[PDB]
Protein backbone atom coordinates (compact mmCIF):
# COMPACT_ATOMS: atom_id res chain seq x y z
CA UNK A 1 0.00 0.00 0.00
CA UNK A 2 2.99 2.26 -0.56
CA UNK A 3 2.76 4.36 -3.74
CA UNK A 4 6.10 3.97 -5.48
CA UNK A 5 8.18 1.83 -3.13
CA UNK A 6 9.10 -1.12 -5.37
CA UNK A 7 10.30 1.29 -8.07
CA UNK A 8 12.26 3.10 -5.34
CA UNK A 9 13.99 -0.10 -4.17
CA UNK A 10 14.61 -0.95 -7.85
CA UNK A 11 16.17 2.53 -8.22
CA UNK A 12 18.34 3.30 -5.19
CA UNK A 13 18.95 -0.08 -3.46
CA UNK A 14 19.38 -2.84 -6.09
CA UNK A 15 20.98 -5.30 -3.64
CA UNK A 16 17.69 -5.86 -1.79
CA UNK A 17 15.76 -7.25 -4.77
CA UNK A 18 16.74 -10.81 -5.70
CA UNK A 19 14.32 -12.06 -8.38
CA UNK A 20 14.66 -15.72 -7.46
CA UNK A 21 12.89 -18.85 -8.69
CA UNK A 22 9.77 -20.39 -7.18
CA UNK A 23 11.68 -23.70 -6.99
CA UNK A 24 14.24 -21.98 -4.72
CA UNK A 25 12.03 -21.85 -1.61
CA UNK A 26 11.70 -25.57 -0.88
CA UNK A 27 10.39 -26.18 2.62
CA UNK A 28 10.19 -22.50 3.56
CA UNK A 29 7.37 -21.68 5.95
CA UNK A 30 5.71 -18.63 4.41
CA UNK A 31 3.00 -16.30 5.69
CA UNK A 32 0.69 -15.03 2.95
CA UNK A 33 -1.61 -12.01 2.89
CA UNK A 34 -4.66 -13.80 1.52
CA UNK A 35 -7.36 -11.17 0.82
CA UNK A 36 -5.49 -9.66 -2.14
CA UNK A 37 -5.05 -13.20 -3.49
CA UNK A 38 -8.84 -13.64 -3.18
CA UNK A 39 -9.34 -10.48 -5.27
CA UNK A 40 -6.66 -11.72 -7.71
CA UNK A 41 -8.69 -14.88 -8.36
CA UNK A 42 -12.09 -13.15 -8.36
CA UNK A 43 -10.75 -10.57 -10.82
CA UNK A 44 -8.65 -12.84 -13.05
CA UNK A 45 -10.46 -16.17 -13.37
CA UNK A 46 -13.55 -15.30 -15.44
CA UNK A 47 -15.30 -17.24 -18.22
CA UNK A 48 -15.75 -14.19 -20.44
CA UNK A 49 -16.97 -11.53 -18.03
CA UNK A 50 -18.93 -13.88 -15.80
CA UNK A 51 -17.12 -15.05 -12.68
CA UNK A 52 -16.66 -18.81 -12.22
CA UNK A 53 -19.87 -19.60 -10.32
CA UNK A 54 -22.00 -22.66 -9.53
CA UNK A 55 -25.62 -23.86 -9.32
CA UNK A 56 -26.50 -22.44 -5.88
CA UNK A 57 -25.61 -18.88 -6.90
CA UNK A 58 -22.39 -18.04 -5.08
CA UNK A 59 -19.00 -17.61 -6.72
CA UNK A 60 -16.17 -20.12 -6.42
CA UNK A 61 -13.39 -18.51 -8.49
CA UNK A 62 -11.28 -17.82 -5.38
CA UNK A 63 -11.73 -21.44 -4.26
CA UNK A 64 -10.66 -22.66 -7.73
CA UNK A 65 -7.66 -20.33 -7.88
CA UNK A 66 -6.28 -20.91 -4.41
CA UNK A 67 -6.83 -24.67 -4.54
CA UNK A 68 -4.78 -24.80 -7.75
CA UNK A 69 -2.20 -22.21 -6.62
CA UNK A 70 -1.76 -23.89 -3.23
CA UNK A 71 -1.27 -27.34 -4.83
CA UNK A 72 1.51 -26.02 -7.06
CA UNK A 73 2.73 -24.04 -4.04
CA UNK A 74 3.44 -27.37 -2.35
CA UNK A 75 4.66 -28.79 -5.67
CA UNK A 76 7.49 -26.25 -5.52
CA UNK A 77 7.72 -27.06 -1.80
CA UNK A 78 6.66 -23.68 -0.40
CA UNK A 79 4.61 -24.15 2.76
CA UNK A 80 2.07 -21.31 3.00
CA UNK A 81 0.29 -19.70 5.92
CA UNK A 82 -2.68 -17.89 4.39
CA UNK A 83 -3.24 -15.01 6.82
CA UNK A 84 -6.69 -13.41 6.65
CA UNK A 85 -7.57 -9.80 7.42
CA UNK A 86 -9.58 -8.69 10.42
CA UNK A 87 -11.13 -5.37 11.43
CA UNK A 88 -9.46 -2.51 9.52
CA UNK A 89 -8.35 0.41 11.73
CA UNK A 90 -9.90 3.86 11.94
CA UNK A 91 -6.85 5.35 10.19
CA UNK A 92 -7.60 3.19 7.12
CA UNK A 93 -11.16 4.60 6.97
CA UNK A 94 -10.22 7.45 4.62
CA UNK A 95 -8.58 5.09 2.12
CA UNK A 96 -11.50 2.67 2.42
CA UNK A 97 -13.86 5.59 1.78
CA UNK A 98 -11.77 6.42 -1.30
CA UNK A 99 -11.99 2.76 -2.39
CA UNK A 100 -15.77 2.82 -1.86
CA UNK A 101 -16.02 6.06 -3.87
CA UNK A 102 -13.97 4.50 -6.68
CA UNK A 103 -16.20 1.41 -6.53
CA UNK A 104 -19.25 3.69 -6.78
CA UNK A 105 -17.75 5.44 -9.82
CA UNK A 106 -16.98 2.01 -11.30
CA UNK A 107 -20.62 1.02 -10.64
CA UNK A 108 -21.88 4.18 -12.39
CA UNK A 109 -19.57 3.56 -15.35
CA UNK A 110 -20.72 -0.09 -15.37
CA UNK A 111 -24.34 1.09 -15.58
CA UNK A 112 -23.26 3.32 -18.46
CA UNK A 113 -21.38 0.46 -20.17
CA UNK A 114 -24.25 -2.02 -19.72
CA UNK A 115 -26.45 0.26 -21.82
CA UNK A 116 -23.50 0.90 -24.15
CA UNK A 117 -23.11 -2.80 -24.98
CA UNK A 118 -19.32 -3.17 -25.14
CA UNK A 119 -18.40 -6.50 -23.51
CA UNK A 120 -14.77 -5.62 -22.72
CA UNK A 121 -15.77 -2.40 -20.94
CA UNK A 122 -18.35 -4.30 -18.85
CA UNK A 123 -15.85 -7.03 -17.90
CA UNK A 124 -13.19 -4.44 -17.00
CA UNK A 125 -15.65 -2.35 -14.96
CA UNK A 126 -16.71 -5.46 -13.08
CA UNK A 127 -13.02 -6.30 -12.72
CA UNK A 128 -12.74 -3.06 -10.74
CA UNK A 129 -15.82 -3.94 -8.65
CA UNK A 130 -14.71 -7.01 -6.65
CA UNK A 131 -15.30 -6.85 -2.88
CA UNK A 132 -15.58 -9.78 -0.47
CA UNK A 133 -17.96 -10.50 2.39
CA UNK A 134 -17.19 -12.75 5.44
CA UNK A 135 -19.02 -15.60 3.63
CA UNK A 136 -16.25 -15.61 0.96
CA UNK A 137 -13.46 -15.74 3.55
CA UNK A 138 -15.45 -18.39 5.47
CA UNK A 139 -15.56 -20.54 2.31
CA UNK A 140 -11.82 -20.00 1.85
CA UNK A 141 -11.10 -20.86 5.49
CA UNK A 142 -13.22 -24.00 5.01
CA UNK A 143 -10.97 -24.84 2.01
CA UNK A 144 -7.84 -24.28 4.07
CA UNK A 145 -9.25 -26.23 7.02
CA UNK A 146 -9.88 -29.17 4.70
CA UNK A 147 -6.45 -28.54 3.12
CA UNK A 148 -4.49 -29.35 6.25
CA UNK A 149 -2.73 -26.01 5.65
CA UNK A 150 -2.91 -23.44 8.46
CA UNK A 151 -4.96 -20.27 8.29
CA UNK A 152 -4.49 -17.44 10.78
CA UNK A 153 -6.97 -14.64 11.47
CA UNK A 154 -5.17 -11.35 11.94
CA UNK A 155 -6.68 -8.92 14.50
CA UNK A 156 -6.23 -5.73 12.47
CA UNK A 157 -4.24 -6.23 9.25
CA UNK A 158 -2.93 -9.38 7.61
CA UNK A 159 0.35 -7.89 6.38
CA UNK A 160 1.21 -6.61 9.89
CA UNK A 161 0.75 -10.11 11.33
CA UNK A 162 2.67 -11.49 8.32
CA UNK A 163 5.55 -9.17 9.25
CA UNK A 164 5.30 -10.28 12.89
CA UNK A 165 5.54 -13.93 11.83
CA UNK A 166 8.66 -13.11 9.82
CA UNK A 167 10.09 -11.10 12.76
CA UNK A 168 9.57 -13.95 15.24
CA UNK A 169 10.99 -16.47 12.77
CA UNK A 170 7.80 -18.55 12.71
CA UNK A 171 7.73 -18.21 8.92
CA UNK A 172 10.66 -17.47 6.65
CA UNK A 173 8.98 -14.76 4.60
CA UNK A 174 5.81 -12.81 3.84
CA UNK A 175 4.38 -13.41 0.36
CA UNK A 176 2.37 -10.51 -1.05
CA UNK A 177 2.99 -7.98 -3.78
CA UNK A 178 1.55 -5.42 -1.38
CA UNK A 179 4.54 -3.48 -0.10
CA UNK A 180 3.37 -2.79 3.47
CA UNK A 181 5.29 -5.75 4.96
CA UNK A 182 8.58 -3.86 4.72
CA UNK A 183 6.89 -0.95 6.50
CA UNK A 184 5.49 -3.19 9.25
CA UNK A 185 8.94 -4.65 9.79
CA UNK A 186 9.36 -7.91 7.86
CA UNK A 187 12.96 -8.75 6.87
CA UNK A 188 11.98 -10.81 3.80
CA UNK A 189 9.06 -9.98 1.47
CA UNK A 190 8.07 -12.21 -1.49
CA UNK A 191 6.43 -10.29 -4.27
CA UNK A 192 4.62 -11.96 -7.21
CA UNK A 193 4.31 -15.47 -5.73
CA UNK A 194 2.40 -17.10 -8.59
CA UNK A 195 2.42 -20.91 -8.64
CA UNK A 196 2.03 -21.46 -12.38
CA UNK A 197 3.54 -23.65 -15.07
CA UNK A 198 3.63 -20.46 -17.16
CA UNK A 199 6.49 -18.98 -15.12
CA UNK A 200 6.30 -15.54 -16.71
CA UNK A 201 7.37 -13.63 -13.58
CA UNK A 202 10.23 -14.48 -11.21
CA UNK A 203 9.67 -14.29 -7.47
CA UNK A 204 10.65 -10.74 -6.48
CA UNK A 205 12.25 -11.19 -3.05
CA UNK A 206 12.69 -8.00 -1.02
CA UNK A 207 15.25 -7.92 1.80
CA UNK A 208 14.80 -5.26 4.48
CA UNK A 209 18.33 -5.81 5.83
CA UNK A 210 19.89 -4.73 2.54
CA UNK A 211 17.51 -1.73 2.46
CA UNK A 212 18.59 -0.63 5.94
CA UNK A 213 22.24 -1.32 5.10
CA UNK A 214 22.08 0.52 1.75
CA UNK A 215 20.00 3.51 2.87
CA UNK A 216 21.60 3.62 6.34
CA UNK A 217 18.32 3.83 8.26
CA UNK A 218 16.59 2.05 11.12
CA UNK A 219 12.96 0.91 11.09
CA UNK A 220 11.63 4.34 12.18
CA UNK A 221 13.25 6.30 9.35
CA UNK A 222 11.98 3.75 6.81
CA UNK A 223 8.44 4.08 8.21
CA UNK A 224 8.79 7.88 7.97
CA UNK A 225 10.09 7.47 4.39
CA UNK A 226 7.05 5.38 3.40
CA UNK A 227 4.73 7.87 5.13
CA UNK A 228 6.37 10.75 3.21
CA UNK A 229 6.21 9.10 -0.21
CA UNK A 230 2.69 7.89 0.32
CA UNK A 231 0.84 5.22 2.26
CA UNK A 232 -2.72 3.94 2.42
CA UNK A 233 -2.95 4.96 6.10
CA UNK A 234 -2.32 8.71 6.02
CA UNK A 235 -1.95 11.36 3.34
CA UNK A 236 1.48 12.23 2.02
CA UNK A 237 2.79 15.78 1.72
CA UNK A 238 1.99 17.19 -1.72
CA UNK A 239 4.98 17.83 -3.96
CA UNK A 240 7.32 15.27 -2.35
CA UNK A 241 7.57 12.00 -4.25
CA UNK A 242 10.03 9.12 -3.73
CA UNK A 243 13.43 10.74 -4.34
CA UNK A 244 12.95 13.95 -2.36
CA UNK A 245 11.53 11.92 0.53
CA UNK A 246 14.68 9.75 0.40
CA UNK A 247 16.83 12.91 0.43
CA UNK A 248 14.74 14.47 3.23
CA UNK A 249 15.03 11.31 5.34
CA UNK A 250 18.78 11.07 4.64
CA UNK A 251 19.50 14.72 5.55
CA UNK A 252 17.64 14.65 8.90
CA UNK A 253 16.18 11.50 10.34
CA UNK A 254 12.79 11.90 12.03
CA UNK A 255 9.58 13.25 10.50
CA UNK A 256 9.29 15.82 13.34
CA UNK A 257 12.30 17.69 11.93
CA UNK A 258 10.72 17.40 8.45
CA UNK A 259 7.45 19.00 9.58
CA UNK A 260 9.18 21.53 11.85
CA UNK A 261 11.85 22.82 9.43
CA UNK A 262 10.34 22.66 5.92
CA UNK A 263 8.50 25.86 4.93
CA UNK A 264 4.76 25.66 4.14
CA UNK A 265 5.13 28.39 1.47
CA UNK A 266 6.47 25.90 -1.12
CA UNK A 267 5.50 22.34 -0.06
CA UNK A 268 2.62 22.72 2.42
CA UNK A 269 1.59 19.99 4.84
CA UNK A 270 -1.97 19.03 3.81
CA UNK A 271 -4.82 19.27 6.40
CA UNK A 272 -2.28 19.53 9.36
CA UNK A 273 -2.88 15.85 10.15
CA UNK A 274 -0.52 14.17 12.60
CA UNK A 275 1.63 11.48 10.98
CA UNK A 276 2.77 10.08 14.34
CA UNK A 277 -0.38 7.97 14.75
CA UNK A 278 0.36 6.27 11.42
CA UNK A 279 3.98 5.89 12.57
CA UNK A 280 2.99 4.21 15.85
CA UNK A 281 0.41 2.08 14.00
CA UNK A 282 3.08 0.83 11.59
CA UNK A 283 5.52 0.12 14.44
CA UNK A 284 3.06 -1.26 17.04
CA UNK A 285 -0.21 -2.46 15.46
CA UNK A 286 -2.99 -4.64 16.84
CA UNK A 287 -1.00 -7.66 15.76
CA UNK A 288 -1.34 -11.44 16.04
CA UNK A 289 0.70 -13.14 18.75
CA UNK A 290 3.30 -15.22 16.87
CA UNK A 291 4.11 -17.65 19.71
CA UNK A 292 0.48 -18.75 20.12
CA UNK A 293 -0.04 -20.08 16.59
CA UNK A 294 -0.08 -23.70 15.39
CA UNK A 295 1.86 -23.72 12.11
CA UNK A 296 1.35 -27.41 11.35
CA UNK A 297 0.87 -28.74 7.81
CA UNK A 298 -1.18 -31.86 8.50
CA UNK A 299 -2.50 -34.61 6.25
CA UNK A 300 -5.33 -33.27 4.05
CA UNK A 301 -8.89 -34.49 4.26
CA UNK A 302 -9.84 -36.10 0.95
CA UNK A 303 -13.40 -37.44 1.22
CA UNK A 304 -14.77 -34.39 3.05
CA UNK A 305 -12.97 -32.17 0.51
CA UNK A 306 -14.62 -34.06 -2.37
CA UNK A 307 -17.96 -33.86 -0.51
CA UNK A 308 -17.60 -30.07 -0.01
CA UNK A 309 -16.35 -29.10 -3.49
CA UNK A 310 -18.72 -31.46 -5.35
CA UNK A 311 -21.78 -31.39 -3.12
CA UNK A 312 -22.17 -27.64 -2.73
CA UNK A 313 -19.70 -26.21 -5.27
CA UNK A 314 -20.08 -28.97 -7.99
CA UNK A 315 -16.52 -29.14 -9.30
CA UNK A 316 -14.94 -31.89 -11.42
CA UNK A 317 -13.66 -34.99 -9.62
CA UNK A 318 -10.40 -35.92 -11.36
CA UNK A 319 -8.70 -32.52 -11.05
CA UNK A 320 -9.31 -32.40 -7.28
CA UNK A 321 -8.15 -36.03 -7.04
CA UNK A 322 -4.94 -35.19 -8.92
CA UNK A 323 -4.52 -32.15 -6.65
CA UNK A 324 -4.90 -34.17 -3.44
CA UNK A 325 -2.52 -36.82 -4.88
CA UNK A 326 0.04 -34.09 -5.62
CA UNK A 327 -0.59 -32.77 -2.09
CA UNK A 328 0.11 -36.25 -0.66
CA UNK A 329 3.28 -36.53 -2.77
CA UNK A 330 4.40 -33.12 -1.51
CA UNK A 331 3.61 -34.09 2.10
CA UNK A 332 5.82 -37.15 1.69
CA UNK A 333 8.51 -34.94 0.15
CA UNK A 334 8.24 -32.01 2.59
CA UNK A 335 10.44 -33.56 5.30
CA UNK A 336 13.59 -32.69 3.32
CA UNK A 337 15.33 -29.66 4.78
CA UNK A 338 17.49 -27.05 3.11
CA UNK A 339 21.22 -26.48 3.09
CA UNK A 340 20.55 -22.99 4.44
CA UNK A 341 19.61 -24.52 7.79
CA UNK A 342 23.10 -26.06 8.05
CA UNK A 343 25.42 -23.99 5.83
CA UNK A 344 25.11 -20.22 6.05
CA UNK A 345 25.04 -18.09 2.91
CA UNK A 346 28.30 -16.13 2.66
CA UNK A 347 27.51 -14.07 -0.44
CA UNK A 348 26.20 -14.50 -3.95
CA UNK A 349 28.44 -14.90 -6.98
CA UNK A 350 27.44 -12.58 -9.83
CA UNK A 351 28.76 -12.93 -13.36
CA UNK A 352 29.76 -10.07 -15.65
Amino acid sequence: GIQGLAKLIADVAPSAIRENDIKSYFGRKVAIDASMSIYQFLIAVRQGGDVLQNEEGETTSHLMGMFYRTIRMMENGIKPVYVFDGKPPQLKSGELAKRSERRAEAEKQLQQAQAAGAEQEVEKFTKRLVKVTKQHNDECKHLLSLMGIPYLDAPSEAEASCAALVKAGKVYAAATEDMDCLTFGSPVLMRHLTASEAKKLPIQEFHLSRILQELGLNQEQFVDLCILLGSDYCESIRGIGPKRAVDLIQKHKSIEEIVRRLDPNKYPVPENWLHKEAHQLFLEPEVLDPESVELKWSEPNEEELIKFMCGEKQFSEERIRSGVKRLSKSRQGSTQGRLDDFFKVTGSLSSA
Binding site: G333, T335, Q336, G337, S350, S351, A352
Partner: protein
Protein backbone atom coordinates in the same frame (compact mmCIF):
# COMPACT_ATOMS: atom_id res chain seq x y z
CA UNK B 1 42.24 -13.62 -20.77
CA UNK B 2 41.62 -17.16 -19.54
CA UNK B 3 43.06 -20.25 -21.25
CA UNK B 4 43.24 -23.85 -19.99
CA UNK B 5 44.31 -26.68 -22.30
CA UNK B 6 43.05 -29.85 -20.63
CA UNK B 7 44.68 -32.93 -22.15
CA UNK B 8 42.01 -35.35 -20.83
CA UNK B 9 38.75 -33.88 -22.10
CA UNK B 10 36.75 -36.94 -21.10
CA UNK B 11 37.14 -35.77 -17.48
CA UNK B 12 35.51 -32.39 -18.19
CA UNK B 13 32.89 -34.07 -20.40
CA UNK B 14 32.06 -36.37 -17.48
CA UNK B 15 31.94 -33.35 -15.12
CA UNK B 16 29.36 -31.65 -17.34
CA UNK B 17 27.46 -34.93 -17.81
CA UNK B 18 27.38 -35.14 -14.01
CA UNK B 19 26.39 -31.52 -13.47
CA UNK B 20 23.88 -31.33 -16.34
CA UNK B 21 21.11 -33.36 -14.68
CA UNK B 22 21.50 -31.71 -11.28
CA UNK B 23 22.14 -28.01 -12.01
CA UNK B 24 20.50 -26.40 -15.01
CA UNK B 25 22.15 -22.95 -14.70
CA UNK B 26 25.52 -22.68 -12.92
CA UNK B 27 28.23 -20.07 -12.42
CA UNK B 28 31.91 -20.98 -12.81
CA UNK B 29 34.23 -19.33 -10.27
CA UNK B 30 37.41 -19.53 -12.33
CA UNK B 31 40.45 -18.06 -10.56
CA UNK B 32 44.22 -18.31 -10.90
CA UNK B 33 44.37 -21.01 -8.21
CA UNK B 34 42.06 -23.26 -10.21
CA UNK B 35 38.61 -23.83 -11.64
CA UNK B 36 35.79 -23.87 -9.09
CA UNK B 37 32.02 -24.23 -9.30
CA UNK B 38 29.79 -23.83 -6.24
CA UNK B 39 26.08 -23.90 -7.09
CA UNK B 40 23.10 -25.59 -5.49
CA UNK B 41 20.13 -27.38 -6.99
CA UNK B 42 17.21 -25.32 -8.31
CA UNK B 43 15.32 -26.68 -5.27
CA UNK B 44 18.31 -25.40 -3.17
CA UNK B 45 18.65 -28.67 -1.22
CA UNK B 46 21.66 -30.14 -3.04
CA UNK B 47 24.96 -28.32 -3.52
CA UNK B 48 27.85 -29.14 -5.85
CA UNK B 49 31.38 -28.01 -5.02
CA UNK B 50 33.38 -28.70 -8.17
CA UNK B 51 37.12 -28.08 -7.94
CA UNK B 52 39.57 -28.36 -10.86
CA UNK B 53 42.97 -27.18 -9.63
CA UNK B 54 45.58 -25.60 -11.90
CA UNK B 55 48.05 -28.48 -11.50
CA UNK B 56 45.68 -30.88 -13.25
CA UNK B 57 45.49 -28.76 -16.40
CA UNK B 58 48.56 -28.61 -18.61
CA UNK B 59 48.74 -24.92 -19.57
CA UNK B 60 46.52 -23.05 -17.10
CA UNK B 61 46.48 -19.26 -17.39
CA UNK B 62 44.02 -16.82 -15.83
CA UNK B 63 44.71 -13.12 -15.31
CA UNK B 64 41.72 -11.94 -13.25
CA UNK B 65 39.34 -14.08 -11.17
CA UNK B 66 36.56 -14.08 -13.74
CA UNK B 67 33.17 -15.46 -12.74
CA UNK B 68 30.86 -16.49 -15.57
CA UNK B 69 27.59 -18.37 -15.80
CA UNK B 70 26.75 -20.85 -18.54
CA UNK B 71 23.84 -23.10 -19.41
CA UNK B 72 25.01 -26.55 -18.34
CA UNK B 73 22.60 -28.21 -20.77
CA UNK B 74 24.09 -26.14 -23.61
CA UNK B 75 27.66 -26.67 -22.36
CA UNK B 76 26.94 -30.41 -22.03
CA UNK B 77 25.60 -30.47 -25.60
CA UNK B 78 28.75 -28.67 -26.77
CA UNK B 79 31.07 -30.95 -24.77
CA UNK B 80 29.32 -33.94 -26.35
CA UNK B 81 30.90 -32.76 -29.62
CA UNK B 82 34.31 -33.73 -28.22
CA UNK B 83 35.50 -37.31 -28.43
CA UNK B 84 36.69 -39.59 -25.67
CA UNK B 85 40.34 -38.58 -26.15
CA UNK B 86 39.81 -35.05 -27.49
CA UNK B 87 42.01 -32.39 -25.89
CA UNK B 88 39.58 -29.75 -24.62
CA UNK B 89 41.17 -26.29 -24.65
CA UNK B 90 39.33 -23.62 -22.68
CA UNK B 91 39.53 -20.03 -23.87
CA UNK B 92 37.87 -16.95 -22.40
CA UNK B 93 38.94 -13.62 -23.88
CA UNK B 94 39.74 -10.52 -21.81
CA UNK B 95 36.46 -8.64 -21.24
CA UNK B 96 34.68 -11.95 -21.75
CA UNK B 97 31.38 -12.21 -23.61
CA UNK B 98 31.69 -15.76 -24.98
CA UNK B 99 33.56 -18.96 -24.14
CA UNK B 100 35.58 -20.72 -26.83
CA UNK B 101 36.08 -24.49 -26.66
CA UNK B 102 38.79 -26.07 -28.82
CA UNK B 103 38.67 -29.86 -29.19
CA UNK B 104 41.88 -31.34 -30.62
CA UNK B 105 42.11 -35.03 -31.41
CA UNK B 106 45.65 -36.42 -30.78
CA UNK B 107 46.16 -38.66 -33.82
CA UNK B 108 44.00 -37.01 -36.48
CA UNK B 109 44.70 -33.27 -36.67
CA UNK B 110 41.26 -31.72 -36.18
CA UNK B 111 40.56 -28.34 -34.58
CA UNK B 112 36.96 -28.26 -33.33
CA UNK B 113 36.53 -24.66 -32.22
CA UNK B 114 33.27 -24.19 -30.30
CA UNK B 115 32.41 -20.64 -29.29
CA UNK B 116 29.66 -20.61 -26.67
CA UNK B 117 27.48 -17.70 -25.59
CA UNK B 118 27.72 -16.59 -21.96
CA UNK B 119 24.81 -15.39 -19.83
CA UNK B 120 24.14 -13.59 -16.56
CA UNK B 121 23.51 -15.40 -13.26
CA UNK B 122 23.06 -14.61 -9.58
CA UNK B 123 24.22 -17.82 -7.86
CA UNK B 124 24.62 -17.98 -4.07
CA UNK B 125 27.98 -19.44 -3.12
CA UNK B 126 28.12 -20.83 0.40
CA UNK B 127 30.78 -21.04 3.07
CA UNK B 128 31.21 -24.71 3.92
CA UNK B 129 33.52 -25.14 6.94
CA UNK B 130 36.35 -27.66 6.92
CA UNK B 131 34.70 -30.03 9.37
CA UNK B 132 35.52 -33.66 10.11
CA UNK B 133 32.75 -36.19 9.56
CA UNK B 134 32.07 -39.20 11.77
CA UNK B 135 30.70 -41.65 9.19
CA UNK B 136 33.19 -41.54 6.31
CA UNK B 137 32.53 -44.34 3.81
CA UNK B 138 34.73 -45.13 0.83
CA UNK B 139 32.95 -47.17 -1.84
CA UNK B 140 33.43 -48.30 -5.40
CA UNK B 141 31.53 -45.78 -7.49
CA UNK B 142 29.63 -48.27 -9.65
CA UNK B 143 28.42 -50.01 -6.49
CA UNK B 144 26.99 -46.76 -5.06
CA UNK B 145 25.53 -45.99 -8.51
CA UNK B 146 23.87 -49.42 -8.50
CA UNK B 147 22.59 -48.90 -4.94
CA UNK B 148 21.01 -45.50 -5.65
CA UNK B 149 19.72 -46.68 -9.05
CA UNK B 150 17.90 -49.72 -7.68
CA UNK B 151 16.73 -48.22 -4.38
CA UNK B 152 15.16 -45.40 -6.43
CA UNK B 153 12.68 -48.02 -7.71
CA UNK B 154 11.59 -48.84 -4.14
CA UNK B 155 10.96 -45.48 -2.50
CA UNK B 156 11.74 -41.77 -2.43
CA UNK B 157 14.19 -41.82 0.49
CA UNK B 158 17.16 -43.92 1.60
CA UNK B 159 17.93 -44.29 5.30
CA UNK B 160 21.73 -44.44 5.31
CA UNK B 161 22.58 -46.33 8.48
CA UNK B 162 26.27 -46.33 9.35
CA UNK B 163 27.77 -49.12 11.47
CA UNK B 164 31.28 -50.34 12.21
CA UNK B 165 30.48 -53.54 10.31
CA UNK B 166 29.34 -51.61 7.25
CA UNK B 167 27.07 -49.00 5.76
CA UNK B 168 23.39 -49.98 5.44
CA UNK B 169 21.09 -48.39 2.85
CA UNK B 170 17.41 -48.81 3.72
CA UNK B 171 14.54 -47.57 1.55
CA UNK B 172 10.82 -48.13 2.14
CA UNK B 173 8.06 -47.52 -0.37
CA UNK B 174 4.63 -48.62 -1.53
CA UNK B 175 6.24 -51.28 -3.74
CA UNK B 176 7.94 -52.85 -0.72
CA UNK B 177 10.91 -52.56 1.59
CA UNK B 178 14.62 -52.77 0.89
CA UNK B 179 17.81 -53.00 2.96
CA UNK B 180 21.13 -52.94 1.12
CA UNK B 181 23.68 -53.59 3.87
CA UNK B 182 27.39 -53.55 3.10
CA UNK B 183 30.47 -54.75 4.93
CA UNK B 184 33.93 -53.32 5.39
CA UNK B 185 36.34 -55.36 3.28
CA UNK B 186 38.63 -57.21 5.67
CA UNK B 187 40.15 -59.09 2.72
CA UNK B 188 41.17 -56.48 0.14
CA UNK B 189 42.35 -57.69 -3.25
CA UNK B 190 41.94 -54.39 -5.13
CA UNK B 191 41.69 -50.83 -3.85
CA UNK B 192 39.01 -49.69 -6.33
CA UNK B 193 36.55 -52.46 -5.35
CA UNK B 194 36.98 -52.24 -1.57
CA UNK B 195 34.81 -50.63 1.10
CA UNK B 196 36.52 -48.90 4.03
CA UNK B 197 34.63 -47.47 7.01
CA UNK B 198 36.18 -44.69 9.14
CA UNK B 199 33.84 -44.50 12.15
CA UNK B 200 33.82 -42.03 15.00
CA UNK B 201 30.23 -42.66 16.16
CA UNK B 202 27.22 -44.44 14.58
CA UNK B 203 24.81 -42.21 12.66
CA UNK B 204 21.40 -42.86 11.08
CA UNK B 205 20.09 -40.32 8.56
CA UNK B 206 17.56 -40.22 5.73
CA UNK B 207 18.31 -38.69 2.32
CA UNK B 208 16.23 -38.16 -0.80
CA UNK B 209 16.84 -40.31 -3.86
CA UNK B 210 16.36 -37.93 -6.80
CA UNK B 211 19.40 -35.89 -5.79
CA UNK B 212 21.25 -39.13 -4.96
CA UNK B 213 20.61 -40.28 -8.54
CA UNK B 214 22.00 -36.93 -9.70
CA UNK B 215 25.05 -37.62 -7.52
CA UNK B 216 25.53 -41.08 -9.03
CA UNK B 217 25.39 -39.51 -12.47
CA UNK B 218 29.08 -38.65 -11.67
CA UNK B 219 30.01 -42.36 -11.78
CA UNK B 220 32.54 -42.52 -14.72
CA UNK B 221 34.59 -39.62 -13.25
CA UNK B 222 36.27 -41.54 -10.44
CA UNK B 223 35.97 -45.13 -9.25
CA UNK B 224 35.77 -44.04 -5.58
CA UNK B 225 32.89 -42.42 -3.68
CA UNK B 226 33.78 -40.85 -0.32
CA UNK B 227 30.43 -40.88 1.48
CA UNK B 228 31.16 -38.50 4.37
CA UNK B 229 28.33 -37.74 6.80
CA UNK B 230 27.56 -37.01 10.44
CA UNK B 231 24.48 -36.59 12.62
CA UNK B 232 22.15 -33.79 11.28
CA UNK B 233 24.96 -32.54 9.01
CA UNK B 234 24.70 -32.74 5.17
CA UNK B 235 26.11 -35.77 3.38
CA UNK B 236 29.29 -35.34 1.35
CA UNK B 237 29.36 -37.48 -1.78
CA UNK B 238 32.93 -36.82 -2.89
CA UNK B 239 34.05 -37.83 -6.38
CA UNK B 240 37.80 -37.28 -6.11
CA UNK B 241 39.06 -37.31 -9.70
CA UNK B 242 42.64 -38.30 -10.52
CA UNK B 243 45.09 -35.59 -9.37
CA UNK B 244 43.13 -32.74 -10.94
CA UNK B 245 40.60 -31.85 -8.26
CA UNK B 246 37.57 -33.18 -6.44
CA UNK B 247 33.84 -33.07 -7.18
CA UNK B 248 31.95 -32.70 -3.93
CA UNK B 249 28.21 -33.21 -3.58
CA UNK B 250 26.17 -31.94 -0.65
CA UNK B 251 22.66 -33.01 0.35
CA UNK B 252 20.48 -31.89 3.23
CA UNK B 253 19.00 -34.80 5.21
CA UNK B 254 15.29 -35.50 5.48
CA UNK B 255 14.96 -34.31 9.07
CA UNK B 256 12.19 -35.70 11.25
Amino acid sequence: MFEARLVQGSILKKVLEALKDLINEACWDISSSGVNLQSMDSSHVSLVQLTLRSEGFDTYRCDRNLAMGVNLTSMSKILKCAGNEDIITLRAEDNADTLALVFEAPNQEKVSDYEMKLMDLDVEQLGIPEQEYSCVVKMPSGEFARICRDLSHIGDAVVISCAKDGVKFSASGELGNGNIKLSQTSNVDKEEEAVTIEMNEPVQLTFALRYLNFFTKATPLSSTVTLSMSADVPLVVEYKIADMGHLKYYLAPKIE
